[PDB]
mmCIF file with all atom_site columns, C-alpha atoms in Angstrom:
data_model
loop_
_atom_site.group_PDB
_atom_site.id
_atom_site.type_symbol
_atom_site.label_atom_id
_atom_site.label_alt_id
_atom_site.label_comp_id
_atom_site.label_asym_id
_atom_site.label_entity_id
_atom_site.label_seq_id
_atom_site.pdbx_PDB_ins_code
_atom_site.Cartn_x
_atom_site.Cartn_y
_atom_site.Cartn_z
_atom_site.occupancy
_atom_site.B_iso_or_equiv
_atom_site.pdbx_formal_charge
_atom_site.auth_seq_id
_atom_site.auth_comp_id
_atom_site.auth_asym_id
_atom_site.auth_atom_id
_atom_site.pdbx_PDB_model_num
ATOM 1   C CA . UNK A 1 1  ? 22.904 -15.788 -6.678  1.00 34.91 ? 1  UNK A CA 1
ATOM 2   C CA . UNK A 1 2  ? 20.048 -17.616 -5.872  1.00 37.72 ? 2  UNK A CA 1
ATOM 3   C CA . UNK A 1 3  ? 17.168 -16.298 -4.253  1.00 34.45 ? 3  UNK A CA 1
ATOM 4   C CA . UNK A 1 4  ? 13.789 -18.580 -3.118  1.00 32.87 ? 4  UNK A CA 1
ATOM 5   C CA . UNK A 1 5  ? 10.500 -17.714 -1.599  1.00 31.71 ? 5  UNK A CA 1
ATOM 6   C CA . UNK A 1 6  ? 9.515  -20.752 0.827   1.00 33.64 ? 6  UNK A CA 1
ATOM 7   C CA . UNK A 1 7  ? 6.441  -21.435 2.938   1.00 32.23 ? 7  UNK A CA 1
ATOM 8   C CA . UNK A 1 8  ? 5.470  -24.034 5.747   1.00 31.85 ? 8  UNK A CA 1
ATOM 9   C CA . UNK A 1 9  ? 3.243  -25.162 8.073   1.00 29.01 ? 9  UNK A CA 1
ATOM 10  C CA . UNK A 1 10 ? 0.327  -24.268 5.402   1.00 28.56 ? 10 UNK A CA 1
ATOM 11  C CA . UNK A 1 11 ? 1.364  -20.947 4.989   1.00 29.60 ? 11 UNK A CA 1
ATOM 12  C CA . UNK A 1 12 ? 1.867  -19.596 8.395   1.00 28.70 ? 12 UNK A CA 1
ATOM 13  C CA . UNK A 1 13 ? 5.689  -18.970 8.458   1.00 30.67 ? 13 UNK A CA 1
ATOM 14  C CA . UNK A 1 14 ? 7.283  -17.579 4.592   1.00 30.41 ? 14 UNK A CA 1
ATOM 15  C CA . UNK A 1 15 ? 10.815 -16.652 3.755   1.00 31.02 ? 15 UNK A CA 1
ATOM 16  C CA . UNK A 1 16 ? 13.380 -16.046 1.469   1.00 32.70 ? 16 UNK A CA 1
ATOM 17  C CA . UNK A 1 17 ? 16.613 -18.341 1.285   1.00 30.52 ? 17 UNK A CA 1
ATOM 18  C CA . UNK A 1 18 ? 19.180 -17.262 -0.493  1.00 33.74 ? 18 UNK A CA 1
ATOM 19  C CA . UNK A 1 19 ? 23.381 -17.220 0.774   1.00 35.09 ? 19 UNK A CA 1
ATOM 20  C CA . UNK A 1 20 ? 26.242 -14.878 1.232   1.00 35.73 ? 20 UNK A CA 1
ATOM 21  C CA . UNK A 1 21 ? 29.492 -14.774 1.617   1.00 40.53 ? 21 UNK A CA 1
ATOM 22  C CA . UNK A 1 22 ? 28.965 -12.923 4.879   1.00 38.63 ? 22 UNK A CA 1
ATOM 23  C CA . UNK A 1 23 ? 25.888 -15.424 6.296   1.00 40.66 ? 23 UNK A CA 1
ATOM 24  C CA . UNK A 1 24 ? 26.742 -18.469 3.986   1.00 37.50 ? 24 UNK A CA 1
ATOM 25  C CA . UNK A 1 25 ? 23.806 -19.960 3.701   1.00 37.28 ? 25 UNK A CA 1
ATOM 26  C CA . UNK A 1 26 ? 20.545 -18.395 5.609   1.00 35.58 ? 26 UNK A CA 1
ATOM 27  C CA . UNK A 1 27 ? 16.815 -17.091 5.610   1.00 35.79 ? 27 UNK A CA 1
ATOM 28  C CA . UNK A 1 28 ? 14.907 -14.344 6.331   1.00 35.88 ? 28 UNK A CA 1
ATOM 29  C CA . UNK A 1 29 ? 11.412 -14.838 7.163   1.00 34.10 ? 29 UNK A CA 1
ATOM 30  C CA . UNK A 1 30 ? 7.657  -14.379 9.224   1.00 34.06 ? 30 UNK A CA 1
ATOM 31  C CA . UNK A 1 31 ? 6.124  -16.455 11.322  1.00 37.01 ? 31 UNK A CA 1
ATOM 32  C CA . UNK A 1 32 ? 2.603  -15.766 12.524  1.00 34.60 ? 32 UNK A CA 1
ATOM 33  C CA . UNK A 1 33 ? 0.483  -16.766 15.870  1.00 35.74 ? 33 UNK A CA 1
ATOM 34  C CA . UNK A 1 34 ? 1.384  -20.267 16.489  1.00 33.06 ? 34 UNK A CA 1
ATOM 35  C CA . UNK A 1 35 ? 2.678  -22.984 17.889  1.00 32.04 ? 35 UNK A CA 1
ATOM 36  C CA . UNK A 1 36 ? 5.979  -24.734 15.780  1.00 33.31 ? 36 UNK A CA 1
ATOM 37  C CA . UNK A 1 37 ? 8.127  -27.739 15.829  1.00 34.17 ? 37 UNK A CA 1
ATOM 38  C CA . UNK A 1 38 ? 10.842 -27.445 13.980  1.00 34.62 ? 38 UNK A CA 1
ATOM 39  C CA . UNK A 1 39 ? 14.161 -30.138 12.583  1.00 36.87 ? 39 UNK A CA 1
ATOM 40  C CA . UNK A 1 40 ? 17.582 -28.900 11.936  1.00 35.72 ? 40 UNK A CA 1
ATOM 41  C CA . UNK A 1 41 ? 20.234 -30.193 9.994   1.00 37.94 ? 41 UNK A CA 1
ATOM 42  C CA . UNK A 1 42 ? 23.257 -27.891 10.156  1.00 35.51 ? 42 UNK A CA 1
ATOM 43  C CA . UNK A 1 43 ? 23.065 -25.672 13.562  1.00 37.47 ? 43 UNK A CA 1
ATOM 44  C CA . UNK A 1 44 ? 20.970 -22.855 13.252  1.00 39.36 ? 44 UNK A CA 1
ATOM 45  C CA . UNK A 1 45 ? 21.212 -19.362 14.588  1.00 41.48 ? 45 UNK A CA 1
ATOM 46  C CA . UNK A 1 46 ? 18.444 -17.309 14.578  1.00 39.98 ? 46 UNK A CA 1
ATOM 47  C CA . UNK A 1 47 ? 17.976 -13.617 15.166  1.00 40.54 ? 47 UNK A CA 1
ATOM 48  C CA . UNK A 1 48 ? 14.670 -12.037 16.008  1.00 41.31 ? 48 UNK A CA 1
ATOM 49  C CA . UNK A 1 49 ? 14.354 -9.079  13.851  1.00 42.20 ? 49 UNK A CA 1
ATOM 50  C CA . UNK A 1 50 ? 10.701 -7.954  15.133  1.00 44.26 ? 50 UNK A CA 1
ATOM 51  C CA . UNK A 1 51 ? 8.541  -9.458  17.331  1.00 45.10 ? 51 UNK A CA 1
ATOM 52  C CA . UNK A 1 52 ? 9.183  -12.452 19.447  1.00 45.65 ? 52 UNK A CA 1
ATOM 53  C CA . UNK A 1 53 ? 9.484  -15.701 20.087  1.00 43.97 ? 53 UNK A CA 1
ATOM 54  C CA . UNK A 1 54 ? 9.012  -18.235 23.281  1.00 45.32 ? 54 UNK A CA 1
ATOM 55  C CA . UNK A 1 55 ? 11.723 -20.905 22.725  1.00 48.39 ? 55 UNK A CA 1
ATOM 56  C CA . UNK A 1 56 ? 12.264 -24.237 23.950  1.00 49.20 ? 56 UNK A CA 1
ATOM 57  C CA . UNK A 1 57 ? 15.691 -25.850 23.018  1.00 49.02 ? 57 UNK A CA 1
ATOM 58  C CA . UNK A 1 58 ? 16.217 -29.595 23.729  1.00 50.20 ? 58 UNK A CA 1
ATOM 59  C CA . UNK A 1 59 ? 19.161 -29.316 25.572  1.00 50.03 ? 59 UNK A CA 1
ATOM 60  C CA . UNK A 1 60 ? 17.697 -27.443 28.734  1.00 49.33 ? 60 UNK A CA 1
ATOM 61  C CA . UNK A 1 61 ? 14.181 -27.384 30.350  1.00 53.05 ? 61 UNK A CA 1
ATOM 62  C CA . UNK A 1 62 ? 12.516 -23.889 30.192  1.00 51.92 ? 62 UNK A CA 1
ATOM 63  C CA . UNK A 1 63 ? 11.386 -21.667 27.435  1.00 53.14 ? 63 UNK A CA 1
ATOM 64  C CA . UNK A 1 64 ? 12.737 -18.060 27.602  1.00 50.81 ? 64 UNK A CA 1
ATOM 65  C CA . UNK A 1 65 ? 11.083 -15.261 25.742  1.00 51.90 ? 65 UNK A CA 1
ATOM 66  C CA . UNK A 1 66 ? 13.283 -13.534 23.211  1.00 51.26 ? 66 UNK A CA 1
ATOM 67  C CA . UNK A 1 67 ? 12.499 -10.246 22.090  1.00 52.99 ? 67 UNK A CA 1
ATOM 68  C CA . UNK A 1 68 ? 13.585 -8.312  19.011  1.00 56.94 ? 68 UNK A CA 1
ATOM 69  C CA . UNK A 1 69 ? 16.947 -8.031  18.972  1.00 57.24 ? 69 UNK A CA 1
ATOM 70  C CA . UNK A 1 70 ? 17.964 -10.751 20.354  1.00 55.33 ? 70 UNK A CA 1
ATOM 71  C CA . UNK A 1 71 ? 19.919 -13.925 18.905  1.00 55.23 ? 71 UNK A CA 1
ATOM 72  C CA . UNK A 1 72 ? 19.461 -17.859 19.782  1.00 52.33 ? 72 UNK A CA 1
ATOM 73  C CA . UNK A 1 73 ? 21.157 -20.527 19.048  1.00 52.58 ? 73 UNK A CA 1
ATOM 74  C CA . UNK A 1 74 ? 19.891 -24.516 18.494  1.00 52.14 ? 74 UNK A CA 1
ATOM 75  C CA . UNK A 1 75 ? 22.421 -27.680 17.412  1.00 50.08 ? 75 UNK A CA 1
ATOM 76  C CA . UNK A 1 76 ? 22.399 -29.386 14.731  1.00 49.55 ? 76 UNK A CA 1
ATOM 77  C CA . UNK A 1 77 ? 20.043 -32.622 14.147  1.00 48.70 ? 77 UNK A CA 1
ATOM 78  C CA . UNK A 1 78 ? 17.452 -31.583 16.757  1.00 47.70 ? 78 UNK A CA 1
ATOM 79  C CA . UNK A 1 79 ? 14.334 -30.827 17.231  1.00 42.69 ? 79 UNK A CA 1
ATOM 80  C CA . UNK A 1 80 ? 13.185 -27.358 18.799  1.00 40.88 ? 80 UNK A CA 1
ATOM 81  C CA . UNK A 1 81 ? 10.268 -25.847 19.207  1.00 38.35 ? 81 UNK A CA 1
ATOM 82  C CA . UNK A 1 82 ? 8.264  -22.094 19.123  1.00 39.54 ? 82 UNK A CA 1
ATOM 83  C CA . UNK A 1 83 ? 5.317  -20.137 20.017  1.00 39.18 ? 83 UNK A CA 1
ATOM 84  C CA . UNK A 1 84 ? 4.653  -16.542 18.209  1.00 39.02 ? 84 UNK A CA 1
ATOM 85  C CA . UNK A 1 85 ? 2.149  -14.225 19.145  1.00 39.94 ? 85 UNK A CA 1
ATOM 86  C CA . UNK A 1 86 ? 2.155  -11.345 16.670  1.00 43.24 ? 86 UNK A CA 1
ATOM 87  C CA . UNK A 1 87 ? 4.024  -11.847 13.259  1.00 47.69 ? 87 UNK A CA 1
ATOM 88  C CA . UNK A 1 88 ? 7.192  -12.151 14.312  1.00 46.23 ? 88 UNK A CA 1
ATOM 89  C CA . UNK A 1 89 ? 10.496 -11.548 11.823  1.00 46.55 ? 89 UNK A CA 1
ATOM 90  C CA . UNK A 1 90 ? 13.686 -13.887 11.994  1.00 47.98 ? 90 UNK A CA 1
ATOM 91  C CA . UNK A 1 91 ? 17.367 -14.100 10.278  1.00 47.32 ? 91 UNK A CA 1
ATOM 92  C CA . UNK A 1 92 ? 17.710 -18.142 10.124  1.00 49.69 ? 92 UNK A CA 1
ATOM 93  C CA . UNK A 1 93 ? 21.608 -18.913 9.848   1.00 49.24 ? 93 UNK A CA 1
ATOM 94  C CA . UNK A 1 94 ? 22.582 -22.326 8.550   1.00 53.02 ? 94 UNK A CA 1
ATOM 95  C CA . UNK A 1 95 ? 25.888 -22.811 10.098  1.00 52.00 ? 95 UNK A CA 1
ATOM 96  C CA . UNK B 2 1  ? -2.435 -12.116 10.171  1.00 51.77 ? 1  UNK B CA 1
ATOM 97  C CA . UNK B 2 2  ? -1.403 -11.596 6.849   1.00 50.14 ? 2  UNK B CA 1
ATOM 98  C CA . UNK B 2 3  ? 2.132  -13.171 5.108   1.00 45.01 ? 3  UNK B CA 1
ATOM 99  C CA . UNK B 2 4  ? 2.324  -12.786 1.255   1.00 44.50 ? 4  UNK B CA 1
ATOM 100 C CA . UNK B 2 5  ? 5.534  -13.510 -0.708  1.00 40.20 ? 5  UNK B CA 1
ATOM 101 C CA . UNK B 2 6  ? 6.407  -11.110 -3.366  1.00 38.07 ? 6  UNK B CA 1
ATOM 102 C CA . UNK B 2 7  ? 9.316  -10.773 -6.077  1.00 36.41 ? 7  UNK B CA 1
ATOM 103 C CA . UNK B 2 8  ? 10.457 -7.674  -8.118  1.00 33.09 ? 8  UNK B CA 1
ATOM 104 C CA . UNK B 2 9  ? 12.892 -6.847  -11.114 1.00 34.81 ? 9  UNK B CA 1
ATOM 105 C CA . UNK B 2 10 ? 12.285 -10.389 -12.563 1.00 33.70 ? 10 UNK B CA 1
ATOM 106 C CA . UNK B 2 11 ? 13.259 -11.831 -9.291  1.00 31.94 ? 11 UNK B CA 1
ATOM 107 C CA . UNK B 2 12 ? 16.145 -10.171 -8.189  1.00 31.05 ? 12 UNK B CA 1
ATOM 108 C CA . UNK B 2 13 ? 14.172 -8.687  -4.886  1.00 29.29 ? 13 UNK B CA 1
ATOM 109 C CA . UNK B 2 14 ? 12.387 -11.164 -3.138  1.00 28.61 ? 14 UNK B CA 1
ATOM 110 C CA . UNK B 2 15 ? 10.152 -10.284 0.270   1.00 27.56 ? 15 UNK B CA 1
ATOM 111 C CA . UNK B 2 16 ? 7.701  -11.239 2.912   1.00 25.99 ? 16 UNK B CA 1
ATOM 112 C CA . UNK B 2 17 ? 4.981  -8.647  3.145   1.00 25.28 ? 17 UNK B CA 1
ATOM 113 C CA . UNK B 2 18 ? 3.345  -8.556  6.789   1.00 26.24 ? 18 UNK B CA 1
ATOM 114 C CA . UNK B 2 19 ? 2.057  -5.940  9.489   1.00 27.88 ? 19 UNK B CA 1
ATOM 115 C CA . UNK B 2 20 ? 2.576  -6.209  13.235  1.00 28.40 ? 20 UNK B CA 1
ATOM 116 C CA . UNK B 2 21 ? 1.590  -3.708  16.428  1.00 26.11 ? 21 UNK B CA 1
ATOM 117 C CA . UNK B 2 22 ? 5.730  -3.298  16.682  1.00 21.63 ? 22 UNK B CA 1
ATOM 118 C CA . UNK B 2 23 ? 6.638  -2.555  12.791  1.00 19.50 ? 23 UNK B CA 1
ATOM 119 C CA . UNK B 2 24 ? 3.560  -1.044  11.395  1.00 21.42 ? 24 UNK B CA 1
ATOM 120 C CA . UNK B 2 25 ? 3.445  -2.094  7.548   1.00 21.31 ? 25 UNK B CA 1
ATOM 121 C CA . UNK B 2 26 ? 6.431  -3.812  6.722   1.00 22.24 ? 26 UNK B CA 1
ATOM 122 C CA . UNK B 2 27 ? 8.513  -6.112  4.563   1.00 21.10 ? 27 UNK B CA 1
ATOM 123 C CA . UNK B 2 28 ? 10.990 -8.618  5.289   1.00 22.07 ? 28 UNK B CA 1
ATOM 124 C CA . UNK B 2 29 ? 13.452 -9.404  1.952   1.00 21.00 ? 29 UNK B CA 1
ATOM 125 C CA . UNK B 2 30 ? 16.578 -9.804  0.051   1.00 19.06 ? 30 UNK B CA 1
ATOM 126 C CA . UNK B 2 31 ? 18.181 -8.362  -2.947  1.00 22.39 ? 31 UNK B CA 1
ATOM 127 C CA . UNK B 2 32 ? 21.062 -9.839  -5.250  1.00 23.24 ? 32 UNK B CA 1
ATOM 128 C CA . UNK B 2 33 ? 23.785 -7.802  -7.003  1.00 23.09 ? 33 UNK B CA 1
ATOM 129 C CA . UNK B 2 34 ? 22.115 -5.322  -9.051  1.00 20.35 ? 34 UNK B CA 1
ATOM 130 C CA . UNK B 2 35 ? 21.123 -1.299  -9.376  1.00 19.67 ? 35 UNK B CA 1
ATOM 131 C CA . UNK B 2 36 ? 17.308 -0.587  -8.247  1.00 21.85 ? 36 UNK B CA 1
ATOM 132 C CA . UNK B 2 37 ? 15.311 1.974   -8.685  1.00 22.25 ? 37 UNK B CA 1
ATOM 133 C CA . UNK B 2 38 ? 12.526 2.207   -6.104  1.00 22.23 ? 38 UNK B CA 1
ATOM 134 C CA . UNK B 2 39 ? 9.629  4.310   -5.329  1.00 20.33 ? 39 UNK B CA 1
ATOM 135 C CA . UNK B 2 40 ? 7.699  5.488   -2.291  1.00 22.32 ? 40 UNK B CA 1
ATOM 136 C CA . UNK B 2 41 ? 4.440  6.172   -1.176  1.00 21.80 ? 41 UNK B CA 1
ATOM 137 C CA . UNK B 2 42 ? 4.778  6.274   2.278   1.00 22.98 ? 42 UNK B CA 1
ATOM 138 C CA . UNK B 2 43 ? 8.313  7.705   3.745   1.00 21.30 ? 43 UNK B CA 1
ATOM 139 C CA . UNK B 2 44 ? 10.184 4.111   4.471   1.00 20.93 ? 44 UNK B CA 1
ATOM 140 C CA . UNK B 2 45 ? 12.789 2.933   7.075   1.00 20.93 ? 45 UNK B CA 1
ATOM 141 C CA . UNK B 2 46 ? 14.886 0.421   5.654   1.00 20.78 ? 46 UNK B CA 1
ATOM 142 C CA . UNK B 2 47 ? 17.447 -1.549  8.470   1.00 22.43 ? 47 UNK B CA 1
ATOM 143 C CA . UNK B 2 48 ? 20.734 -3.917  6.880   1.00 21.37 ? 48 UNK B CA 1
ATOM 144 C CA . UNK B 2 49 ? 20.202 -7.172  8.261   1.00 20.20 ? 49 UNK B CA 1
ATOM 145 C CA . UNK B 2 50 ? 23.151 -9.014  5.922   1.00 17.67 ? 50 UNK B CA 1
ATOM 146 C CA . UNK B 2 51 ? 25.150 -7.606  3.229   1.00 13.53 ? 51 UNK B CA 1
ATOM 147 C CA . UNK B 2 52 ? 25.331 -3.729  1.890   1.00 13.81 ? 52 UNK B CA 1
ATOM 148 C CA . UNK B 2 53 ? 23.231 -1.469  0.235   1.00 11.09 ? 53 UNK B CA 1
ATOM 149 C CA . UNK B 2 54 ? 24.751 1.589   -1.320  1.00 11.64 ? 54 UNK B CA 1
ATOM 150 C CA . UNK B 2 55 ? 22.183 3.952   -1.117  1.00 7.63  ? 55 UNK B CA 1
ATOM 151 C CA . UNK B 2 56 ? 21.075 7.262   -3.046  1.00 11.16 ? 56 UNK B CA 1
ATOM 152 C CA . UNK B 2 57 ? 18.334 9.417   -1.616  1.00 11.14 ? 57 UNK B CA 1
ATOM 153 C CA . UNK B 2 58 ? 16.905 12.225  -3.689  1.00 9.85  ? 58 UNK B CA 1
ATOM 154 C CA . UNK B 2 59 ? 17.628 15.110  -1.431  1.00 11.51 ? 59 UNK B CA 1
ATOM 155 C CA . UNK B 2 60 ? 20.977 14.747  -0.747  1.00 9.60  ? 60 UNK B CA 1
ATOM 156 C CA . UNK B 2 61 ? 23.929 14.621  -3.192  1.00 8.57  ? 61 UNK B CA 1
ATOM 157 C CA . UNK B 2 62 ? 26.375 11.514  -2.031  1.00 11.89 ? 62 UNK B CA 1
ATOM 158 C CA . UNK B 2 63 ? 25.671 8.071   -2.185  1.00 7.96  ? 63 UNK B CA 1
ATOM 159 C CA . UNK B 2 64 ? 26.445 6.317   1.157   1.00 5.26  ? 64 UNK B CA 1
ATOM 160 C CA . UNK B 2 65 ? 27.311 3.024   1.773   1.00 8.52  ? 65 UNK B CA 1
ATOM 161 C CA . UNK B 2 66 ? 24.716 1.338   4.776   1.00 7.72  ? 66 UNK B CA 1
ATOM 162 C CA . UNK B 2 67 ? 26.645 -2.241  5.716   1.00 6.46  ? 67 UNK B CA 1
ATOM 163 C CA . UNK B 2 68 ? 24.837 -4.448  8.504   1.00 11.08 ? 68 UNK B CA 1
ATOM 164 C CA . UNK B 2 69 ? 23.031 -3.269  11.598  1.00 10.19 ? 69 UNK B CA 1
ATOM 165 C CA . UNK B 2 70 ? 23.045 0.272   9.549   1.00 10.75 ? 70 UNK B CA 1
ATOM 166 C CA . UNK B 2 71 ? 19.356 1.782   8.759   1.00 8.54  ? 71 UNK B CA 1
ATOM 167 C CA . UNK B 2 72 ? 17.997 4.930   6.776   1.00 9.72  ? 72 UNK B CA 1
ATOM 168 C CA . UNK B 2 73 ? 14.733 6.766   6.473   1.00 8.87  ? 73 UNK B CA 1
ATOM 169 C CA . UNK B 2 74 ? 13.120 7.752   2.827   1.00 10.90 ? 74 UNK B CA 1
ATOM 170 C CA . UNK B 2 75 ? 10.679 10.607  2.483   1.00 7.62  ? 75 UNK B CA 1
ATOM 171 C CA . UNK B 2 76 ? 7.074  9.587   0.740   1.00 5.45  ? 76 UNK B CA 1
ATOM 172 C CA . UNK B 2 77 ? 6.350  9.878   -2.178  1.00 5.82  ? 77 UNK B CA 1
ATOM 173 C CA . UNK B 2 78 ? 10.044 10.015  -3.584  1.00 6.55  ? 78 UNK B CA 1
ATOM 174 C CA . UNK B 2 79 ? 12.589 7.908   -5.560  1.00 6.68  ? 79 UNK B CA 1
ATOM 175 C CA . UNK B 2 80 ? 15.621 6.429   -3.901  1.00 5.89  ? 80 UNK B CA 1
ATOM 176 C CA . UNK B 2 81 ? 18.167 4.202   -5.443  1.00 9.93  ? 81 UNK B CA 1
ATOM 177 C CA . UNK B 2 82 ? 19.941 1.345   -4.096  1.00 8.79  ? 82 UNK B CA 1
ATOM 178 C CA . UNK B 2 83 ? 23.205 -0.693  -5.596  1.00 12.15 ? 83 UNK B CA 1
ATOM 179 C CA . UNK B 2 84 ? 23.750 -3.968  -4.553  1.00 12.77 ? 84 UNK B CA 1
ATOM 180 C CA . UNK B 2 85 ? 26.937 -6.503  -4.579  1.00 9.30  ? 85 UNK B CA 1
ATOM 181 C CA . UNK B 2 86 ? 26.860 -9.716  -2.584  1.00 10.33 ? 86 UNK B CA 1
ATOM 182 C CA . UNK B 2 87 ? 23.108 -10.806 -1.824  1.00 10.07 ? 87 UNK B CA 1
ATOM 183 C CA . UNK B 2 88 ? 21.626 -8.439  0.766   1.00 13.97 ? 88 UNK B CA 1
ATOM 184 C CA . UNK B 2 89 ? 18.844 -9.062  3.478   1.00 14.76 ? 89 UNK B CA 1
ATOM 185 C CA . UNK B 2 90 ? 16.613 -6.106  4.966   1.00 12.02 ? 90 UNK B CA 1
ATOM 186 C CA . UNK B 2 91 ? 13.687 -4.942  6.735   1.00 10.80 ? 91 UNK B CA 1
ATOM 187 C CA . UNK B 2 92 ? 11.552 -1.964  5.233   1.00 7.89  ? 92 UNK B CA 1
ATOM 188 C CA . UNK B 2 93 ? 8.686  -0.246  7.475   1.00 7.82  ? 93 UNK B CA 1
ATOM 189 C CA . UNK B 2 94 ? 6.046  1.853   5.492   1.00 8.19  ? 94 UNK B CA 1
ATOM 190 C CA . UNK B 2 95 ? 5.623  4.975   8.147   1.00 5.86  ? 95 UNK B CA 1
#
């Protein structure tokens, strides 16, 4: 298995990808204070593990505020975007 | 706000070091199939995001085996030992 330490946006969000049978492939991560546009390919889910994060999806007009615990989802060949306040944590699923 | 990558075992554990107000200390990773040995300084809660970890702590005889959404607690300054089979992703707080 393959396992890869990543980093964007000069540093400010860092993860590991790697896959499994059980995630196929995916990333677990940090993001820090910010403000973050981000492209998909496949789908995405994403779980906040700690933390949070205001999203806005492109499908629908408001952000909501999703706390740790909770699970979003965003299609595939769009554009979303995020705002983090204190280092937040995230499972990225590449579906 | 502090993010630093960091690898292990030649690679086989891979993380994202950070610290929030929520987490304390923490660490964001993965781990491919393998038998660790790990050491403490302060106690550590580790949380299954994806995969397994079969788990030996030293006070207790059995090994136990912690699948997704599962967490455990460490004492400081011990040894704990971990085997892993399909690429495994975690979160570990420093108490």
């Amino acid at each position: 298995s393959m396992l890869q330490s990543n980093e964007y946006f000069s540093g400010k969000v860092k993860s590991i990808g790697f896959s499994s049978s059980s995630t196929g492939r995916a990333s677990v991560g940090v993001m820090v204070e910010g403000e973050y546009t981000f492209s998909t390919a496949e789908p995405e889910e994403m779980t906040v593990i700690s933390g949070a994060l205001n999203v806005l999806l492109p499908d629908a007009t408001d952000w909501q505020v999703y706390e740790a615990g909770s699970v979003f989802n965003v299609p595939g060949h769009s554009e979303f975007h995020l705002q983090v306040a204190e280092p937040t944590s995230y499972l990225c699923r590449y579906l």
